[PDB]
Amino acid sequence: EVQLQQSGAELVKPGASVKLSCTASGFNIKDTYMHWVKQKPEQGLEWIAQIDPANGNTKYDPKFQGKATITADTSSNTAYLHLSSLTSEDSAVYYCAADPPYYGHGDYWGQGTTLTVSSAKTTPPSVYPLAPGSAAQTNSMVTLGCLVKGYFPEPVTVTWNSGSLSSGVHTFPAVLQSDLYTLSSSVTVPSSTWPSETVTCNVAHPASSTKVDKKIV
């Protein structure tokens, strides 16, 4: 019955500010302590601040002091986190957490809210087919690839043969290159089926509502 619902993913421009929310259900936040935790990509968890929704008393971690402001509205049973003068180092996932009055039972953490700080505009991905330059890469079998360059924002969907090929597939995590994302997906198939049967990679970029198909030769 206990649950913390957080506001949706956020995309913001550097210099701006944003206000995240964490609404508690199944329990009154007045009887507890609310916390906001930040987790950078691949980094560790960092406690930011705490507040007593009962008296508004707040505690901050010095490095966040000034940049972050924690508040709470017991009437709506909600806790907020305001971040100002955003920069890329503010990009991370933010979790709100309730210090339980009874640890034993219940998941007192929120799902988290992603905050991405970029000045980049929605940009469809440039899809480039990757074919083997004629060379025995591995005994018989072969490996193909697709390069998805310069797109924004994440994510994109990379399927092979629309789905008929979901074996031996390796899609690598996107990586930032000049404010845009780049990613690559490889596909392994027995030397017997290629170039026999045709192989296409299907990329889809929701944000740009574009879907490309690239055949490999």
Binding site: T143, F172, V175
Partner: protein
Amino acid sequence: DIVLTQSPAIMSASLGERVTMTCTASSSVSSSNLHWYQQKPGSSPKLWIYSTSNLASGVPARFSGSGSGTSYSLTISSMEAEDAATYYCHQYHRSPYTFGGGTKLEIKRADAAPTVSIFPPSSEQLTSGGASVVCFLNNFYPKDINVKWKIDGSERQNGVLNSWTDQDSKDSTYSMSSTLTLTKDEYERHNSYTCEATHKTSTSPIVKSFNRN
């Protein structure tokens, strides 16, 4: 600031194996204010063990925690696949509340060499005046690997972007992709492109190259 140090940062273990990880504080805390969290990729941190040794709701019996003062530890009697995750100890004793760097627990398996593949740029990509050479190093173990790019026997480190996947969910292997990005120009002014990789699995650096055309 009470500093929490977790050790080791990354550890591997086969299933059925007993596992112990530690967490030491720079200064003493109440065993009641030390908690462990489990976090799996994409999901939010979950309370695993609270107050040093109490299992949270829904936590398997093969898990146990011990300690007091400045030394704590989390133990898994028999490791299972679903146990692979990252574990964080946390002290809610004296603010600012801290977290340890966490210990990433991975599934150990037999060593495996990477199967390399070098890929020349794309005609289509060349048409735009850009050129990216991609190298795939798939299904290997351990994760430790060192890739190097050689353009005409010369080492090139400018324009390289690497990316690794997580331990495979099925065969518990790792994969990595490395991309070297140049211009139509400075790429067309070199002949040999080399993708070199040294893995525990070999003292002889694995090489995959190609010449223009």
